[PDB]
């Protein structure tokens, strides 16, 4: 990740997220956002009118990217020794 902006994601991950779209993110739709207010009869509000609901995942997007950031950073500092135990510092030139 780039420390210039606290996005908690790398350059490639942003492109990956923006390349593929999602049906309806957020799960924060209230009255006024459904037929209690005004809509064109969106599919999401029709689903909720018949007991159909979608639950959010336990892990957020930011938390998932933290694991990837830790995994990538660990490789550049220890290689694969940290996977079998404690981390072992080593120059990257000698590691490669």
């Amino acid at each position: 990740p780039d420390p210039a902006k606290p996005s908690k994601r790398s350059f490639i991950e942003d492109l990956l997220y923006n390349k593929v779209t999602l049906a309806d993110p957020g799960f924060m739709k209230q009255y006024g956002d459904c037929l209690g207010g005004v809509n064109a009869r969106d599919l999401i509000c029709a689903q909720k009118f018949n007991g159909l609901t979608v639950l959010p995942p336990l892990l957020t997007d930011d938390m998932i990217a933290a694991y990837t950031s830790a995994l990538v950073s660990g490789t550049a500092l220890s290689g694969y020794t940290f996977g079998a135990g404690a981390a072992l510092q080593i120059p990257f030139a000698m590691q490669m």
Partner: protein, 97 residues
């Protein structure tokens, strides 16, 4: 021999029943020209065409209706919309949720 059609066109012959005005912001049991239902009715801004008495949907669920006395469209929304979840620590543990 008497023949009649039901719930396809605006009606001209109705039974001997009296109206009980209009209630707002409450989910109640309404009856509009023989259309029993349940839900909240606050206001409507939908625009439609004449010769219409009911508002249909892709799932055949009523959402709008025209008041025959005030000649204005209303809205129907079920009394329960959102989902509710309850977290409990166990029966032996406690009863607070």
């Amino acid at each position: 021999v008497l023949s009649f059609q039901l719930l396809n066109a605006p009606a001209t012959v109705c039974g001997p029943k009296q109206s009980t005005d209009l209630v707002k912001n409450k989910c109640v049991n309404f009856n509009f020209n023989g259309l029993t239902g349940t839900g909240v009715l606050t206001d409507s801004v939908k625009k439609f065409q004449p010769f219409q008495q009911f508002g249909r949907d892709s799932s055949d669920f009523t959402d709008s209706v025209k008041d025959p006395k005030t000649l204005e469209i209303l809205d129907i929304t079920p009394c329960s919309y959102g989902g509710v979840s309850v977290i409990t620590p166990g029966t032996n543990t406690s009863d607070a949720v």
